């Protein structure tokens, strides 16, 4: 008998890839000289190997979180939801805004899938639990839930979030931003959450800050005692310049 999940299995060469990304990150960032990439890999593998892939906890990732500290300035955070490429293109142009992918852990795990099995050290290259179809507490989803919660908790001053105005649901309360990040912004550190609704499609222009999902985000943020601000980015290329 072999247990089979609905999701794709661990990315081929996952151990080598994580180790190589750790080494590349330390070679490009001077503030990472004290980081031992072999220890980072051992902490990462230790979070999920030998464990049932549907019973992973935020606590399983604590050793990895201790090795992969966050150093980005809290007043320069850009969150985003379903507009990844434009958000990262904007940060490369501003050079004074950072996303979760700018951190060691965000950079290590991006676009990778991984899981193990109970009692053995074997990484499952055949299949991994799908968050929706199999189980929410899988190694990948738990990792992103933990790292995005820490990223949001650290934020301060004005936090910006880029949203895709051409989507049917502009703010989706089920996304990582909607279900994790918004709920961990601290009012004693964060004065305002400012949404930038990008009009990056050919849709008929309209004030998208009036969309029902934006009113829902405003309500969530207001109940946390944080100010909400929303801006329409009617001309994204002009906003970049
Ligand atoms: C309270 O419990 C109940 C809720 O549970 C949480 C729900 C979220 C879940 N997130 C992910 C699950 C997981 O399996 N994978 C593999 C993840 C891969 C990466 C990240 C990711 C990276 N950056 N971020 C920070 O969050 C904001 C951006 O995320 P979003 O707003 O989600 O934007 P989206 O453009 O839609 O997605 C970003 C990517 O993630 C995938 N993803 C998203 N949601 C899921 C999901 N439920 N199941 C499977 N995959 C999911 C999606 O396919 C895309 O590749 C930014 O501000 C960043 O700082 C999060 C997240 C996930 C964790 C569990």
UniProtKB/Swiss-Prot annotation:
Effect of residue 156 to E: Loss of cADPR hydrolase activity
GO biological process, one term: response to hydroperoxide
Consequence when changing residue 128 to A: Loss of cADPR hydrolase and ADP-ribosyl cyclase activity
Listed result of changing residue 156 to D/K/A: Loss of cADPR hydrolase and ADP-ribosyl cyclase activity
EC numbers on record: 3.2.2.-, 3.2.2.6, 2.4.99.20
pH influence on activity: Optimum pH for NAADP(+) production is 5.0 from either substrate, activity is much higher at pH 5.0 than 7.4.
Residue intervals on the Extracellular side: 1-241
Regulation: ATP inhibits the cADPR hydrolyzing activity.
Subcellular location: Cell surface; Membrane
Tissue: Expressed at high levels in pancreas, liver, kidney, brain, testis, ovary, placenta, malignant lymphoma and neuroblastoma.
Glycosylated residues, chain numbering: 55, 119, 164, 174
Impact when changing residue 115 to A: Loss of cADPR hydrolase and ADP-ribosyl cyclase activity
Keywords associated with the record: Diabetes mellitus, Disulfide bond, Glycoprotein, Hydrolase, Membrane, NAD, NADP, Receptor, Signal-anchor, Transferase, Transmembrane, Transmembrane helix
Disulfide-linked positions: 22-37, 54-135, 115-128, 209-230
Further remarks about this protein from its record: A cell surface antigen recognized in lymophocytes by multiple mAbs.
Assembly and binders: Homodimer.
Family (UniProt): Belongs to the ADP-ribosyl cyclase family.
Biological role stated in the UniProt entry: Synthesizes cyclic ADP-ribose (cADPR), a second messenger for glucose-induced insulin secretion. Synthesizes the Ca(2+) mobilizer nicotinate-adenine dinucleotide phosphate, NAADP(+), from 2'-phospho-cADPR and nicotinic acid, as well as from NADP(+) and nicotinic acid. At both pH 5.0 and pH 7.4 preferentially transforms 2'-phospho-cADPR into NAADP(+), while preferentially cleaving NADP(+) to cADPR and ADPRP rather than into NADDP(+). Has cADPR hydrolase activity.
Record-given protein name: ADP-ribosyl cyclase/cyclic ADP-ribose hydrolase 1
Species, as recorded: Homo sapiens
Gene name as annotated: CD38
Part of the intact protein present: 46 to 286 of 300
